[PDB]
Amino acid sequence: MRVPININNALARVRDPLSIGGLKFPTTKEIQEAVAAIADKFNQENDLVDRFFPEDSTFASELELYLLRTQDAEQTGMTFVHQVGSTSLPVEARVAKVDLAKATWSPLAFKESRVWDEKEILYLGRLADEVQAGVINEQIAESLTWLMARMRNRRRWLTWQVMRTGRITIQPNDPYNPNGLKYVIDYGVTDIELPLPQKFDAKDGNGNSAVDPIQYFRDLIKAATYFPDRRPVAIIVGPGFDEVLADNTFVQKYVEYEKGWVVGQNTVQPPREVYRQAALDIFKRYTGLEVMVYDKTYRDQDGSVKYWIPVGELIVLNQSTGPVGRFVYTAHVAGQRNGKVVYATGPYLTVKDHLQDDPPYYAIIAGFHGLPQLSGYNTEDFSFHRFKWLKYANNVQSYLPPFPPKVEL
Amino acid sequence: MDKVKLFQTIGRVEYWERVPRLHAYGVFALPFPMDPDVNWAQWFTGPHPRAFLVSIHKYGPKAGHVYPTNLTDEDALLNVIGMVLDGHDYENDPNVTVTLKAAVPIEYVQQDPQAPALQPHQAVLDAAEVLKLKVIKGHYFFDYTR
């Protein structure tokens, strides 16, 4: 939403009309003009999650899944012993069992509105130019585009909320909830977080560390051997992560093992920068976890830049890098194509003319129906180990350059 | 928790084999009227396989009707005639096939309907001589024809 101004006329009409104050006669002068654009460059959209939840859509509202399981009696037993010349004796009785199960899914709803009264539609001119009444026509298009982006933000918000906490939680204390509709949609992620009592950047005494990250992911892979779906593959960590590998004791000892840089005999001491320029590579080589990076930022209400992946935390994917289910829309109402109601599926946007009514007004309404769904579940147990979080360090902001303030002028 | 309910078990069906008898010993069965007074639907409840000793009315108004043997009354102990191996539906037939001469394990003789299955009932063993069941192994032996 820009100010309705013409920059050329406004930039020309500041120059003084008469203003002989200095020399008691008008002086000679030269004037150059230039405009400036001001924006916050560091408020980038959360592009990560749309790569991971694709968009399908069903006309029906609810989704249920039925799982038939079957346990059969395996061929147990041992053949009976007897003397030759005897009779024969019968075997015992065996047992097989059959169970079922039931899933349940149900969408949500979203809608919001605008309005423009008569004084706003009739009176709107540019701020310096002198034009007709034709500015509110250009002004409603920005509100149309803003409602479109405002719906994409709820798609990405729901999908980020389910990747962040497993459940998605709405409550009346929230900023963008006037209705106050409380929701706990527990998607049933089994172990959402990984335990670290002592974090990776935790040092006791004199430079000695506390835990070991490469060995931590090594025995996660080892202790998820016979669960072939808990065995991690990739990491997506945003901020400066090489420094946490470069300052702790054990990964420094692994870099010094690899490059042979014993401090008294081979070389004096390598700098910390030479550590961090290869610590991630030796980490990736000794584990095999392909680490992705995702360092986009959002300007929150503090005025302080924060990353999308919070500093000190890294996500862990547990079986593969791919779509973790999908985000699925449901159907809304579109009115009577022939004589009977025929629906539509995507996010809709409706315009309403009331320019004939008393007083004339004009309202645009957009919204949608939908909710994310986690497709692939475990079969024999009903678990879901696909993504996990862990908080790895506490002081990562000190490893980062500072951020500029927002220009409020 | 609210908009999405997860998996939850609805049904459970288990299925067993039958009550095994000895091939070498022989089977002999004669069908009998079921005594309508005793609650027969209690005796055929569970999916576990069982078998239960049956005594016949010698006389009275219900002479010929057979009922599950009560181990307290001697006039119900002496006139025992056999034991129903398989299982039966009293809601469709008042005429069960009582087996007279067979050889069934101790594990599968349960004289009470609430007695635990797959476990030897003790009062049948402590009344093994009155009921003329000879125990030589696990497997019982009975010939109520002779």
Coordinates of C-alpha atoms in Angstrom, one line a residue:
Chain A
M1 CA 0.0 0.0 0.0
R2 CA 1.8 3.1 -1.3
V3 CA 0.9 6.7 -0.5
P4 CA -1.1 8.0 -3.4
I5 CA 1.5 10.7 -4.4
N6 CA 3.0 11.9 -7.6
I7 CA 6.7 12.2 -6.8
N8 CA 7.6 14.7 -9.6
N9 CA 5.0 17.3 -8.7
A10 CA 5.6 16.9 -4.9
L11 CA 9.3 17.1 -5.5
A12 CA 8.9 20.3 -7.6
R13 CA 6.4 22.1 -5.2
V14 CA 8.7 22.3 -2.2
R15 CA 10.9 25.0 -3.8
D16 CA 10.3 28.4 -2.4
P17 CA 7.7 30.6 -4.0
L18 CA 9.2 34.1 -3.4
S19 CA 11.4 33.9 -0.3
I20 CA 13.8 36.8 -0.6
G21 CA 15.3 36.8 2.9
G22 CA 19.0 36.5 2.4
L23 CA 20.6 39.2 0.3
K24 CA 17.5 41.4 -0.4
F25 CA 17.6 40.2 -4.0
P26 CA 17.1 36.7 -5.6
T27 CA 20.4 34.7 -6.0
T28 CA 21.4 32.3 -8.7
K29 CA 21.3 28.7 -7.8
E30 CA 21.4 25.1 -9.1
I31 CA 19.1 22.4 -7.9
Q32 CA 19.3 18.6 -8.3
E33 CA 16.6 16.2 -7.2
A34 CA 16.5 12.5 -6.2
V35 CA 14.0 10.2 -4.6
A36 CA 14.6 7.2 -2.3
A37 CA 12.9 3.9 -1.7
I38 CA 12.8 2.6 1.9
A39 CA 11.9 -1.0 2.6
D40 CA 12.8 -3.8 5.1
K41 CA 14.9 -6.2 2.9
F42 CA 15.2 -8.8 5.7
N43 CA 11.5 -9.8 5.9
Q44 CA 11.4 -12.8 3.6
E45 CA 8.6 -15.3 3.3
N46 CA 8.9 -18.9 4.7
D47 CA 9.5 -20.6 1.4
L48 CA 10.6 -23.9 3.1
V49 CA 7.4 -25.6 3.9
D50 CA 5.6 -25.3 0.5
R51 CA 8.5 -27.4 -0.9
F52 CA 7.4 -30.1 1.5
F53 CA 3.6 -30.2 1.6
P54 CA 2.0 -30.5 -1.9
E55 CA -1.5 -29.3 -2.6
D56 CA -4.3 -31.7 -3.4
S57 CA -8.0 -31.1 -2.7
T58 CA -11.0 -33.3 -2.0
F59 CA -14.6 -32.2 -2.4
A60 CA -15.7 -34.2 0.7
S61 CA -15.2 -32.8 4.1
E62 CA -14.0 -35.7 6.4
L63 CA -11.4 -38.3 5.6
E64 CA -11.2 -41.6 7.4
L65 CA -8.8 -44.6 7.0
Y66 CA -9.4 -48.2 8.0
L67 CA -6.4 -50.5 8.6
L68 CA -6.9 -54.2 8.7
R69 CA -4.2 -56.1 10.6
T70 CA -3.8 -59.9 10.7
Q71 CA -1.7 -61.9 13.2
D72 CA -1.5 -65.6 12.3
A73 CA -0.2 -68.5 14.4
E74 CA 3.2 -69.3 13.2
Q75 CA 4.3 -72.9 12.8
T76 CA 5.5 -73.6 16.4
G77 CA 5.9 -76.8 18.3
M78 CA 8.0 -79.9 18.6
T79 CA 7.1 -83.4 17.5
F80 CA 6.2 -85.7 20.4
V81 CA 8.5 -88.5 21.7
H82 CA 7.3 -92.1 22.1
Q83 CA 8.6 -95.6 22.0
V84 CA 8.2 -97.6 18.8
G85 CA 5.2 -100.0 18.9
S86 CA 2.9 -97.5 20.6
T87 CA -0.1 -95.4 19.5
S88 CA -0.1 -91.7 18.6
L89 CA -1.2 -88.6 20.5
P90 CA -2.8 -85.4 19.2
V91 CA -1.3 -81.9 19.1
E92 CA -2.4 -78.8 21.0
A93 CA -4.6 -76.0 19.6
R94 CA -3.4 -72.8 18.0
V95 CA -4.9 -69.3 17.7
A96 CA -4.9 -66.5 15.1
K97 CA -6.3 -63.0 15.7
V98 CA -7.6 -60.2 13.5
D99 CA -8.1 -56.5 14.5
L100 CA -9.1 -53.2 12.8
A101 CA -8.6 -49.5 13.3
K102 CA -10.1 -46.1 12.3
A103 CA -8.6 -42.8 11.3
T104 CA -10.4 -39.5 11.3
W105 CA -9.7 -36.1 9.7
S106 CA -11.7 -32.9 9.5
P107 CA -10.9 -29.5 7.9
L108 CA -11.1 -25.9 9.1
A109 CA -12.5 -22.7 7.7
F110 CA -11.2 -19.2 7.1
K111 CA -12.7 -15.9 5.8
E112 CA -12.2 -12.1 6.2
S113 CA -13.7 -9.0 4.8
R114 CA -13.1 -5.4 3.7
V115 CA -15.4 -2.4 3.2
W116 CA -15.2 1.0 1.5
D117 CA -17.7 3.7 2.4
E118 CA -19.0 6.5 0.1
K119 CA -16.6 9.2 1.3
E120 CA -13.7 7.0 0.4
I121 CA -14.8 6.0 -3.0
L122 CA -16.0 9.4 -4.1
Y123 CA -13.1 11.5 -2.6
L124 CA -9.7 10.1 -3.3
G125 CA -7.1 12.2 -5.2
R126 CA -3.4 12.1 -5.4
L127 CA -1.4 13.9 -2.8
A128 CA 0.3 16.5 -5.1
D129 CA -1.1 16.0 -8.6
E130 CA -4.6 17.4 -9.4
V131 CA -6.6 14.6 -11.0
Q132 CA -10.1 13.1 -11.3
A133 CA -11.8 10.6 -9.0
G134 CA -10.0 7.5 -10.2
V135 CA -7.6 6.5 -7.4
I136 CA -9.8 4.1 -5.4
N137 CA -9.9 1.9 -8.5
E138 CA -6.2 1.4 -8.2
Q139 CA -6.5 1.2 -4.4
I140 CA -8.8 -1.8 -4.3
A141 CA -6.4 -3.9 -6.4
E142 CA -3.8 -3.8 -3.7
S143 CA -6.4 -5.0 -1.1
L144 CA -7.2 -7.9 -3.5
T145 CA -3.5 -8.9 -3.7
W146 CA -3.1 -8.4 0.0
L147 CA -6.0 -10.8 0.8
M148 CA -4.4 -13.3 -1.6
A149 CA -1.0 -13.1 0.2
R150 CA -2.9 -13.1 3.5
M151 CA -4.4 -16.5 2.6
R152 CA -1.0 -17.9 1.5
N153 CA 0.4 -16.9 4.8
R154 CA -2.2 -19.0 6.6
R155 CA -1.4 -22.0 4.5
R156 CA 2.3 -21.6 5.3
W157 CA 1.5 -20.8 8.9
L158 CA -0.5 -24.0 9.5
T159 CA 2.2 -26.1 7.8
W160 CA 4.9 -24.4 9.7
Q161 CA 3.0 -24.9 13.0
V162 CA 2.7 -28.6 12.4
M163 CA 6.4 -28.9 11.5
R164 CA 7.3 -26.9 14.5
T165 CA 5.2 -28.4 17.4
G166 CA 3.5 -31.4 15.8
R167 CA 0.2 -30.2 17.0
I168 CA -1.4 -27.0 15.8
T169 CA -2.8 -24.7 18.5
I170 CA -5.3 -21.8 18.2
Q171 CA -6.4 -19.9 21.2
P172 CA -8.1 -16.6 22.0
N173 CA -4.8 -14.9 23.1
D174 CA -3.6 -15.1 19.5
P175 CA -3.1 -11.9 17.5
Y176 CA -5.0 -12.9 14.3
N177 CA -8.0 -14.6 16.1
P178 CA -10.9 -12.3 17.0
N179 CA -13.2 -15.3 17.2
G180 CA -11.2 -17.0 19.9
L181 CA -11.7 -20.5 18.6
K182 CA -9.6 -22.8 20.7
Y183 CA -8.1 -25.7 18.8
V184 CA -5.7 -28.5 19.7
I185 CA -5.3 -30.6 16.5
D186 CA -2.9 -33.3 17.8
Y187 CA -1.4 -35.0 14.8
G188 CA 0.3 -37.6 17.1
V189 CA 3.9 -37.1 16.3
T190 CA 5.5 -39.7 18.6
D191 CA 8.7 -38.0 19.9
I192 CA 8.8 -34.5 18.6
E193 CA 12.0 -33.4 20.4
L194 CA 15.3 -34.9 21.1
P195 CA 16.7 -34.7 24.6
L196 CA 19.9 -32.7 25.3
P197 CA 20.5 -32.0 29.0
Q198 CA 23.8 -30.4 28.3
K199 CA 23.8 -28.5 25.0
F200 CA 26.6 -28.7 22.4
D201 CA 28.0 -25.2 23.2
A202 CA 28.2 -26.0 27.0
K203 CA 31.7 -25.7 28.4
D204 CA 32.9 -26.5 31.9
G205 CA 36.2 -25.5 33.5
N206 CA 38.9 -24.4 31.0
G207 CA 37.7 -25.0 27.4
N208 CA 36.6 -28.5 28.0
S209 CA 33.2 -29.3 26.4
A210 CA 30.4 -31.4 27.8
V211 CA 28.8 -33.5 25.0
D212 CA 29.7 -34.6 21.4
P213 CA 27.5 -33.8 18.4
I214 CA 29.0 -36.2 15.8
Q215 CA 28.8 -39.1 18.3
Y216 CA 25.3 -38.0 19.3
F217 CA 24.0 -38.4 15.7
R218 CA 26.1 -41.5 15.4
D219 CA 24.4 -43.3 18.2
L220 CA 21.0 -42.0 17.1
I221 CA 21.7 -43.8 13.8
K222 CA 22.9 -46.8 15.7
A223 CA 20.1 -46.9 18.2
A224 CA 17.6 -46.6 15.4
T225 CA 18.9 -49.6 13.5
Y226 CA 16.0 -52.1 13.7
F227 CA 13.5 -49.2 13.4
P228 CA 14.2 -48.5 9.8
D229 CA 12.1 -45.3 9.8
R230 CA 13.7 -43.5 12.8
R231 CA 17.1 -43.6 11.2
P232 CA 17.9 -39.9 10.2
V233 CA 18.9 -38.7 6.7
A234 CA 19.0 -35.0 6.5
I235 CA 19.3 -31.8 8.6
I236 CA 17.9 -28.4 7.8
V237 CA 19.6 -25.8 10.0
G238 CA 19.5 -22.1 9.3
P239 CA 22.0 -19.9 11.2
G240 CA 25.7 -20.1 11.8
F241 CA 26.2 -23.7 12.7
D242 CA 29.8 -24.2 11.7
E243 CA 31.0 -22.2 14.7
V244 CA 29.3 -24.6 17.2
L245 CA 31.2 -27.4 15.4
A246 CA 34.4 -25.3 15.5
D247 CA 34.5 -24.2 19.2
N248 CA 33.6 -27.5 21.0
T249 CA 36.3 -29.8 22.1
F250 CA 35.5 -33.1 20.4
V251 CA 35.0 -31.8 16.9
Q252 CA 38.2 -29.8 17.2
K253 CA 39.9 -33.0 18.2
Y254 CA 38.4 -34.7 15.1
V255 CA 39.6 -32.0 12.8
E256 CA 43.1 -32.2 14.4
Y257 CA 43.0 -36.0 14.0
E258 CA 42.2 -35.6 10.3
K259 CA 44.6 -32.9 9.3
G260 CA 47.3 -34.1 11.7
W261 CA 47.6 -30.7 13.3
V262 CA 49.0 -31.7 16.7
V263 CA 49.8 -28.4 18.3
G264 CA 53.4 -28.9 19.4
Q265 CA 54.9 -30.8 16.5
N266 CA 53.2 -30.3 13.2
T267 CA 52.1 -26.6 13.2
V268 CA 51.8 -23.9 15.9
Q269 CA 48.0 -23.6 16.2
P270 CA 45.4 -23.3 13.4
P271 CA 42.9 -20.4 13.7
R272 CA 39.3 -20.9 14.4
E273 CA 38.4 -19.9 10.9
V274 CA 40.4 -22.8 9.4
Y275 CA 38.5 -25.0 11.8
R276 CA 35.1 -23.8 10.7
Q277 CA 35.9 -23.9 7.0
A278 CA 36.2 -27.7 7.2
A279 CA 34.3 -28.8 10.3
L280 CA 31.0 -29.1 8.6
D281 CA 32.7 -31.2 5.8
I282 CA 34.3 -33.6 8.2
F283 CA 31.0 -33.8 10.2
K284 CA 29.1 -34.7 7.0
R285 CA 31.8 -37.2 6.0
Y286 CA 31.8 -39.0 9.4
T287 CA 28.0 -39.2 9.7
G288 CA 26.5 -39.0 6.2
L289 CA 23.7 -36.7 7.2
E290 CA 23.3 -34.2 4.3
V291 CA 22.9 -30.9 6.0
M292 CA 20.7 -28.3 4.3
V293 CA 20.8 -24.6 5.2
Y294 CA 17.7 -22.3 5.3
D295 CA 18.4 -18.8 6.5
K296 CA 15.4 -16.7 5.7
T297 CA 14.2 -14.1 8.2
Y298 CA 11.1 -12.5 9.6
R299 CA 10.8 -9.1 11.3
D300 CA 8.6 -9.7 14.3
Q301 CA 7.1 -7.0 16.6
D302 CA 10.3 -6.6 18.6
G303 CA 11.9 -4.8 15.7
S304 CA 14.7 -7.4 15.9
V305 CA 15.4 -9.8 13.0
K306 CA 14.9 -13.5 13.7
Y307 CA 15.5 -16.4 11.5
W308 CA 12.8 -18.9 10.5
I309 CA 14.8 -21.8 11.9
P310 CA 15.5 -20.4 15.4
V311 CA 19.1 -20.0 16.4
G312 CA 20.3 -22.9 18.5
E313 CA 17.8 -25.4 17.0
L314 CA 18.1 -27.8 14.1
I315 CA 15.4 -29.9 12.5
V316 CA 16.0 -33.6 11.8
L317 CA 14.3 -35.7 9.1
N318 CA 13.9 -39.3 10.1
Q319 CA 13.4 -41.5 7.0
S320 CA 14.0 -39.5 3.8
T321 CA 13.9 -36.0 2.3
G322 CA 10.5 -35.7 0.8
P323 CA 6.8 -34.8 1.2
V324 CA 5.6 -35.2 4.8
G325 CA 2.0 -35.8 3.8
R326 CA 0.3 -32.9 2.1
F327 CA -1.9 -29.9 2.6
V328 CA -5.4 -30.5 1.4
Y329 CA -8.2 -28.1 0.8
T330 CA -11.9 -28.9 0.9
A331 CA -14.9 -27.5 -0.9
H332 CA -16.7 -24.2 -0.3
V333 CA -19.9 -22.9 -1.8
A334 CA -20.5 -21.3 -5.2
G335 CA -24.0 -20.5 -6.2
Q336 CA -26.4 -22.3 -8.6
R337 CA -24.8 -22.6 -12.0
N338 CA -27.9 -24.1 -13.7
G339 CA -30.4 -24.2 -10.9
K340 CA -28.5 -26.3 -8.4
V341 CA -25.5 -25.6 -6.2
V342 CA -22.1 -26.4 -7.7
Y343 CA -19.1 -26.1 -5.5
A344 CA -15.5 -24.9 -5.9
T345 CA -12.3 -26.1 -4.2
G346 CA -9.5 -23.6 -4.0
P347 CA -9.2 -20.4 -2.1
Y348 CA -11.9 -18.1 -3.3
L349 CA -12.2 -14.3 -3.4
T350 CA -15.5 -12.5 -3.9
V351 CA -16.3 -8.9 -4.7
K352 CA -19.5 -7.2 -3.9
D353 CA -21.0 -4.1 -5.4
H354 CA -23.3 -2.1 -3.1
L355 CA -22.7 1.2 -5.0
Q356 CA -26.4 1.6 -5.6
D357 CA -27.5 1.2 -2.0
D358 CA -27.9 3.8 0.7
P359 CA -25.2 4.8 1.4
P360 CA -23.2 3.3 -1.4
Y361 CA -20.4 0.9 -0.2
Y362 CA -18.2 -1.8 -1.5
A363 CA -16.9 -4.9 0.1
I364 CA -14.4 -7.7 -0.9
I365 CA -14.4 -11.0 0.9
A366 CA -11.8 -13.9 0.6
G367 CA -11.2 -17.1 2.4
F368 CA -10.8 -20.8 2.1
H369 CA -11.3 -24.3 3.8
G370 CA -8.4 -26.7 4.4
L371 CA -6.0 -28.4 6.9
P372 CA -2.7 -30.3 6.5
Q373 CA -2.7 -34.0 6.6
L374 CA 0.1 -36.5 7.4
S375 CA -0.1 -39.3 4.9
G376 CA 2.4 -42.0 5.7
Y377 CA 1.9 -43.6 9.1
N378 CA 3.5 -46.6 10.7
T379 CA 1.6 -49.9 10.2
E380 CA 2.1 -52.3 13.1
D381 CA 2.4 -49.5 15.7
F382 CA 0.6 -46.2 15.0
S383 CA 3.7 -44.1 15.4
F384 CA 5.0 -41.3 13.1
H385 CA 8.7 -40.7 13.1
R386 CA 9.4 -38.5 10.2
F387 CA 10.7 -35.2 11.5
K388 CA 12.2 -34.2 14.9
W389 CA 13.6 -31.1 16.5
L390 CA 16.5 -30.6 18.8
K391 CA 17.9 -27.5 20.5
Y392 CA 21.6 -27.8 20.1
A393 CA 23.1 -24.5 21.5
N394 CA 22.1 -21.5 23.5
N395 CA 24.5 -18.7 22.5
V396 CA 24.5 -18.5 18.7
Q397 CA 23.5 -14.8 18.3
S398 CA 27.0 -13.8 19.5
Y399 CA 28.4 -15.7 16.5
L400 CA 26.3 -13.6 14.1
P401 CA 26.6 -10.1 12.6
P402 CA 24.2 -7.5 13.9
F403 CA 21.0 -6.5 12.1
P404 CA 20.0 -3.0 11.0
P405 CA 17.0 -1.2 12.6
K406 CA 13.9 -0.5 10.6
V407 CA 13.8 3.0 9.1
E408 CA 10.6 4.6 10.4
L409 CA 10.7 7.7 8.2
Chain B
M1 CA -7.2 -34.2 19.8
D2 CA -10.1 -32.1 18.5
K3 CA -10.3 -31.9 14.7
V4 CA -8.3 -35.0 14.0
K5 CA -8.8 -38.3 15.9
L6 CA -6.0 -40.9 15.4
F7 CA -6.2 -44.6 14.9
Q8 CA -8.0 -46.7 17.5
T9 CA -8.8 -50.4 17.7
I10 CA -12.5 -51.2 16.9
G11 CA -12.7 -54.9 16.5
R12 CA -11.0 -58.0 17.8
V13 CA -11.8 -61.5 16.5
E14 CA -9.7 -64.5 17.5
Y15 CA -10.2 -68.0 16.1
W16 CA -8.9 -71.4 17.4
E17 CA -8.7 -75.0 16.3
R18 CA -11.0 -77.7 17.6
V19 CA -10.8 -80.1 20.6
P20 CA -8.4 -82.9 19.5
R21 CA -9.2 -86.6 20.2
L22 CA -7.1 -89.6 19.6
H23 CA -7.2 -91.3 16.2
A24 CA -6.1 -94.6 17.6
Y25 CA -8.9 -95.0 20.2
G26 CA -12.2 -94.3 18.4
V27 CA -15.3 -92.1 18.4
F28 CA -18.9 -93.1 19.1
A29 CA -21.7 -90.5 19.3
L30 CA -25.5 -90.6 19.8
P31 CA -27.6 -87.5 19.6
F32 CA -29.7 -86.4 22.6
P33 CA -32.3 -83.8 23.5
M34 CA -31.0 -80.8 25.3
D35 CA -32.5 -80.0 28.7
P36 CA -34.2 -76.5 28.2
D37 CA -34.0 -75.4 31.8
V38 CA -30.2 -75.0 32.0
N39 CA -28.8 -71.9 30.5
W40 CA -27.1 -73.4 27.4
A41 CA -25.9 -70.1 26.0
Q42 CA -23.5 -69.8 28.9
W43 CA -21.8 -73.1 28.0
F44 CA -20.9 -72.1 24.4
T45 CA -19.6 -68.5 25.0
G46 CA -15.9 -68.3 24.5
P47 CA -13.8 -68.8 21.3
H48 CA -11.5 -71.1 23.2
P49 CA -12.2 -74.8 22.7
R50 CA -13.6 -76.8 25.5
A51 CA -15.6 -80.0 26.4
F52 CA -17.9 -80.7 29.3
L53 CA -19.4 -83.9 30.8
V54 CA -23.1 -84.5 30.2
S55 CA -25.5 -86.5 32.3
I56 CA -28.9 -87.9 31.2
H57 CA -32.1 -87.9 33.1
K58 CA -32.9 -91.5 33.9
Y59 CA -36.6 -90.9 34.5
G60 CA -39.0 -88.1 35.4
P61 CA -40.9 -85.8 33.0
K62 CA -37.7 -84.9 31.1
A63 CA -36.5 -88.5 30.6
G64 CA -34.1 -88.5 27.7
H65 CA -33.1 -84.8 28.0
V66 CA -29.4 -84.3 28.7
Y67 CA -27.8 -81.5 30.7
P68 CA -24.3 -80.5 31.8
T69 CA -23.3 -82.5 34.8
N70 CA -23.3 -80.8 38.2
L71 CA -20.5 -82.2 40.4
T72 CA -22.6 -81.8 43.6
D73 CA -25.5 -84.2 43.1
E74 CA -24.9 -87.9 43.0
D75 CA -28.0 -88.6 41.0
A76 CA -26.4 -86.3 38.5
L77 CA -23.0 -88.0 38.9
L78 CA -24.0 -91.6 38.4
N79 CA -26.0 -91.3 35.2
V80 CA -23.3 -89.5 33.2
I81 CA -23.4 -90.5 29.5
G82 CA -20.8 -88.5 27.6
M83 CA -19.2 -85.2 26.7
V84 CA -19.7 -82.7 23.9
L85 CA -16.5 -82.1 22.2
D86 CA -17.1 -79.5 19.5
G87 CA -19.6 -76.8 20.5
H88 CA -23.1 -76.1 19.5
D89 CA -25.9 -73.4 19.0
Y90 CA -28.8 -73.8 21.3
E91 CA -30.5 -70.9 19.5
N92 CA -31.0 -73.2 16.5
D93 CA -31.0 -76.8 17.8
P94 CA -32.2 -78.5 21.0
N95 CA -30.4 -81.7 19.9
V96 CA -26.7 -81.9 20.6
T97 CA -24.3 -84.7 19.5
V98 CA -23.0 -86.2 22.8
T99 CA -19.9 -88.2 22.3
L100 CA -19.9 -91.5 24.2
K101 CA -16.4 -93.0 23.7
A102 CA -13.5 -90.8 22.9
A103 CA -10.1 -89.7 24.3
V104 CA -9.7 -86.0 25.1
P105 CA -6.9 -84.2 27.0
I106 CA -7.1 -83.1 30.6
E107 CA -6.5 -79.5 29.3
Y108 CA -9.8 -79.4 27.4
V109 CA -12.2 -80.8 29.9
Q110 CA -13.9 -77.9 31.7
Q111 CA -17.0 -78.7 33.7
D112 CA -17.7 -75.1 34.6
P113 CA -18.4 -72.3 32.1
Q114 CA -16.5 -69.7 34.0
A115 CA -13.6 -72.0 34.8
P116 CA -10.4 -70.9 32.9
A117 CA -9.8 -72.5 29.6
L118 CA -6.6 -74.3 28.5
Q119 CA -6.0 -75.3 32.2
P120 CA -7.0 -78.6 33.8
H121 CA -10.1 -78.4 35.9
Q122 CA -9.4 -79.9 39.4
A123 CA -12.9 -81.1 40.5
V124 CA -13.1 -83.4 37.5
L125 CA -9.9 -85.0 38.6
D126 CA -11.1 -85.2 42.2
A127 CA -14.3 -86.9 40.9
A128 CA -12.5 -89.0 38.3
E129 CA -13.6 -92.3 39.8
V130 CA -17.3 -91.4 40.3
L131 CA -17.5 -90.1 36.8
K132 CA -15.5 -93.2 35.5
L133 CA -12.9 -91.2 33.7
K134 CA -9.6 -93.1 33.9
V135 CA -6.5 -90.8 33.7
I136 CA -3.3 -92.5 32.4
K137 CA -1.7 -89.5 30.8
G138 CA -2.9 -86.0 30.0
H139 CA -5.5 -87.6 27.8
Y140 CA -8.7 -88.8 29.4
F141 CA -10.4 -92.1 28.5
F142 CA -14.1 -92.9 28.7
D143 CA -16.4 -95.6 27.3
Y144 CA -19.9 -95.0 28.8
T145 CA -21.3 -97.5 26.4
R146 CA -19.9 -100.6 28.0

